[PDB]
């Protein structure tokens, strides 16, 4: 008859579990009685206690303040929380217009490590001193009396060195990775490139530890002749706005602007002048000594034979980064099925060269 004591502790847990489940139901009942609010952005600052806003759910309104209003973080052009009845501002919201978390890629710190960018150490060491230092300790250059550079141009073959150097710099520094390609700028719209740079500048203003990266900037550049617009609407608005942000009254000291293209001669020399872009860095192809450490990441991670020779496929490899070797090891598995082996061979990896040589030169 004493065996029922084991069920006493088991049933008592169910009494405590159901009591917590029924309590969460009452909390959901009390949560439905809550009243939400609206959202908008300040169009104009009339005074300190009055802000001209624009409602997303209705026409333009002019609202007041309620409580916990920080006048430093809240100013003209900042997203607010509108009231449906009294038309007041309650909560302060960050500035967002376009899908900055969709059209723009934002990731915490970096992804790609230093082992993939290896071989550039001589150049990277000089770049980290003018980039990593002002982001960590801004007082280094203040005692010297100089200013850190803003734009840094990384150019080379498409897909080679553009993705690696983008996520590697943000990984060693600790700043967030911002990917905003130049292909999201020039379109058919009224003032698209005007609001892309402003919202991109607003995101870097809210979060200081961030670095902006771009891609394929050759389409948004060019000097034309007199540096005006002829049958290109969105190119000139991009050329001038990028010049006024860095050389204006408010620049990004905690955010560096990065561009990527095939050649620097295809851009507008107006943006290549000192004061904005101070650095031109060419991305070459990795040599036999440079590619030795490339195949040691992805190819060395997958299961391979102990006698596998790395140097056998390096001489036949041309311009293969950490992303390109994923396909080389993948294409090597197709030719290794005929040999009935659970691993890869150095001669089977060399068979992925001529297969790619049919497309690329």
């Amino acid at each position: 008859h004493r065996r029922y004591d084991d069920q006493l502790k088991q049933r008592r847990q169910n009494i405590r579990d159901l009591e917590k489940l029924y309590d969460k139901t009452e909390n959901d009942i009390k949560a439905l009685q809550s009243i939400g609010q609206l959202i908008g952005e300040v169009m104009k600052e009339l005074s300190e206690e009055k802000y001209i806003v624009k409602a997303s759910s209705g026409p333009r309104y002019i609202v007041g303040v309620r409580n916990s209003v920080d006048r430093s973080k809240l100013k003209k052009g900042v997203r607010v929380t509108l009231d449906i009845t009294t038309l007041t501002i309650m909560r302060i919201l960050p500035r967002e217009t376009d899908p900055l978390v969709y059209n723009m890629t934002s990731f915490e710190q970096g992804e790609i490590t230093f082992d993939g960018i290896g071989g550039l150490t001589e150049q990277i060491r000089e770049l980290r001193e003018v980039i990593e230092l002002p982001l960590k300790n801004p007082e280094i250059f203040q005692r010297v009396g100089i200013k850190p550079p803003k734009g840094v141009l990384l150019y080379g073959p498409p897909g080679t060195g553009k993705t690696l150097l983008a996520k590697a710099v943000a990984a060693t520094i600790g700043a967030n990775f911002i990917f905003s390609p130049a292909s999201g700028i020039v379109d058919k719209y009224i003032g698209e490139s005007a609001r892309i740079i402003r919202e991109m500048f607003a995101y870097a203003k809210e979060h200081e530890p961030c670095i902006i990266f771009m891609d394929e900037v050759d389409a948004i550049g060019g000097r034309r002749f007199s540096e005006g617009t002829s049958a290109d609407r969105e190119i000139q608005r991009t050329l001038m706005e990028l010049l006024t942000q860095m050389d204006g009254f408010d620049n990004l000291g905690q955010t560096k602007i990065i561009m990527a293209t095939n050649r620097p001669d295809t851009l507008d020399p107006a943006l290549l002048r000192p004061g904005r872009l101070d650095r031109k860095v060419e991305i070459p192809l990795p040599n036999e000594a440079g590619r030795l450490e490339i195949f040691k990441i992805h190819t060395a991670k997958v299961k391979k034979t102990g006698e596998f020779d790395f140097e056998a496929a390096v001489k036949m490899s041309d311009g293969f980064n950490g992303a390109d070797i994923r396909n080389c090891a993948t294409e090597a598995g197709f030719f290794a099925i005929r040999d009935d082996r659970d691993h890869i061979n150095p001669d089977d990896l060399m068979k992925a060269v001529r297969k790619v040589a049919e497309v690329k030169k």
Binding site: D98, S183, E234, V302, K303, N327, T330, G333, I337
Partner: protein
Amino acid sequence: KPTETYSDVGGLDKQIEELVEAIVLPMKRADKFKDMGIRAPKGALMYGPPGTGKTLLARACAAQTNATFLKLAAPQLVQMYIGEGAKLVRDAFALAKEKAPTIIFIDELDAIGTKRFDSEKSGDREVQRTMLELLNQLDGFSSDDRVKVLAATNRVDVLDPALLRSGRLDRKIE
């Protein structure tokens, strides 16, 4: 599971050799690639004139592995309100859950796949967010051979190295 074979349309064996290698082999038996640790490709880029076998061998490759045929039309991916075609990325993935295998097709990739020199994907957000949802869904199952995404169109203009890798559309099959 459409009903088709490779003998119904002949003369494409030159292209079929590239299709079976990048579709049937990584899907049917994945135990050869999983023992090596490498990731099998989930798709191959296809381009060519209409009626040349790009849409003809679509159901053929799905019938060999017994997979569900899902076709995405280009005019169906552009709407007014944000939604519709943008949800088809999750809709085609929703049918992939219950059904054991899957193969996803995209007709006329050049509509949503070619940005040219224009950002107009920002103008109509159903086109851009469709490509954005693909990057999240293609990275959902890395080692699963039962989720495949394919596309077919006329030509190829804009290249996206972020889309070129194992597990996405990479190899160009003309």
